């Protein structure tokens, strides 16, 4: 039950006309936001007994942004062809003023000329929904690919006879792939969602962007991390101590002792233990997949509290010598981040909440699994002292973390800072 089946094309055309007419960007954004909110409310009210239906804003988003349409090939009917087809279908006189105006459009766009020509002829109220318009456009594109102009002519005639002059002009602009609503694609994506432009750039597609980023509350962090899935952990950026205080706006930060361990991630679900590396490689065999197998997994099953059943963690793997109680540089595990606990996803939550909940995941046990040692600092002298202590301990350097920083997988920068002597 697609929403586009119940949304007349006239409403979208009127919204686009209002957006174009408005002078200030605020009015255009307000109109687009009102249309999007109405669409989302209708979608929520329609799919009540839903099963994660694959219905989104794509039917209208593709028309709003024709330049990003990759599913449909070239229509094969450009401005000259469109003017000619309007001339034959409307049965205008070849020497009549309208015919010359349509043909002589100075190869004040063609859409305006077509609208003026069709105003006295077209109806006042159309009857085509967004789904029907999309189907007709897809049929036109497919017929152009198949080299069958009769079906293209029939579809164009249907569109002309079942739409109003404003609808004809907007359809012409969509076919030409030139709207110029006064708001850039970036603004449209931003109003649609805060993490839409980057998702579209990385994925290069609109339908996925429309579907995944449907709920405004659910950001890219929630969908970027999934159970039993290998995601890309982020990394810090090298920074100098002399300007360290300028990195986080002079706000309080967290100092962590860097460990020269392999960066890996782990998922716990009952008696199921999954492991993954930064590159997606699976090393579960090294530590086993069940508490009855492996060397490290058996000793950590009891560490987790009863309140923790399903969880995801990320950390560093190293080698530990209990005899000297030492860590060997390039089985002990240090945990410094939790990305999901129980049903809820912790990706949206900032680093402070992750640190707060870390203490409630399991009781640290030296030798097998614990929480990486760290402190809170807000002064350059504290950073210098931490670096000196780390060097005295043979540690490579220090990590500076911003509590306000959020989880943004596959990105460089943010609150993740790596300080080393140089």
């Amino acid at each position: 039950q697609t929403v586009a089946s119940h949304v007349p094309f006239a409403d979208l055309c009127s919204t686009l006309e209002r957006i174009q007419k408005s002078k200030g960007r605020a009015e255009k954004i307000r109109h687009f936001r009102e249309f999007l909110d109405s669409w989302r409310k209708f979608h929520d009210a329609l799919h009540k007994n839903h099963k994660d239906v694959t219905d989104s804003f794509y039917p209208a988003m593709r028309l709003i942004l024709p330049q990003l349409e990759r599913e449909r090939m070239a229509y094969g009917i450009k401005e000259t062809m469109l003017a000619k087809l309007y001339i034959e279908l409307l049965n205008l006189p070849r020497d009549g003023k309208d015919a010359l105006k349509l043909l002589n459009y100075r190869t004040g766009d063609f859409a305006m000329i077509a609208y003026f020509v069709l105003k006295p002829r077209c109806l006042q109220k159309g009857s085509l929904t967004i789904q029907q318009v999309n189907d007709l456009l897809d049929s036109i594109a497919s017929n152009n690919s198949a080299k069958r102009k009769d079906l293209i002519k029939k579809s164009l005639l249907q569109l002309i006879t079942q739409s109003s002059a404003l609808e004809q002009k907007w359809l012409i602009r969509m076919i030409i792939k030139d709207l110029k609503l006064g708001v850039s694609q970036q603004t449209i994506f931003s109003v649609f969602h805060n993490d839409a432009a980057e998702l579209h750039n990385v994925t290069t597609d609109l339908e996925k962007v429309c579907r995944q980023l449907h709920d405004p509350s659910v950001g890219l962090s929630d969908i970027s991390i999934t159970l039993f899935s290998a995601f890309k952990p982020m990394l810090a950026a090298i920074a100098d101590i002399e300007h360290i205080e300028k990195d986080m706006k002079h706000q309080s930060f967290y100092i962590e002792t860097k460990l020269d361990g392999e960066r890996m991630q782990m998922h716990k679900d009952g008696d199921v233990y999954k492991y993954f590396s930064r590159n997606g490689y699976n090393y579960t065999d090294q530590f086993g997949a069940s508490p009855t197998e492996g060397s490290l997994t058996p000793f950590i099953h009891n560490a987790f509290k009863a309140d923790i059943q399903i969880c995801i963690l990320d950390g560093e793997m190293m080698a530990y010598n209990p005899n000297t109680q030492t860590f060997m540089q390039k089985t002990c595990y240090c945990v410094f981040d939790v990305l999901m606990v129980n049903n809820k996803k912790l990706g949206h939550e900032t680093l402070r909440k992750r640190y707060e909940i870390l203490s409630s995941i399991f009781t640290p046990i030296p030798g097998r699994i614990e929480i990486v040692q760290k402190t809170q600092a807000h002064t350059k002298n504290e950073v210098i002292d931490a670096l000196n202590e780390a060097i005295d301990k043979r540690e490579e350097g220090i990590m500076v973390k911003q509590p306000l920083s959020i989880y943004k997988p596959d990105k460089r920068g943010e609150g993740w800072l790596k300080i080393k002597p140089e």
């Binding site: 949304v7 007349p8 409403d11 109405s38 209708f42």
Partner: peptide
């Protein structure tokens, strides 16, 4: 139940300026 219609609404500061216009006709 409702329909799409229900969800989608139908829908002194400054300075004075003076220009002096003078006829240049013979009678003037």
């Amino acid at each position: 139940m409702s329909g799409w219609e229900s969800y989608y609404k139908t829908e002194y500061s400054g300075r004075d300026s003076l220009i002096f216009l003078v006829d240049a006709s013979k009678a003037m």
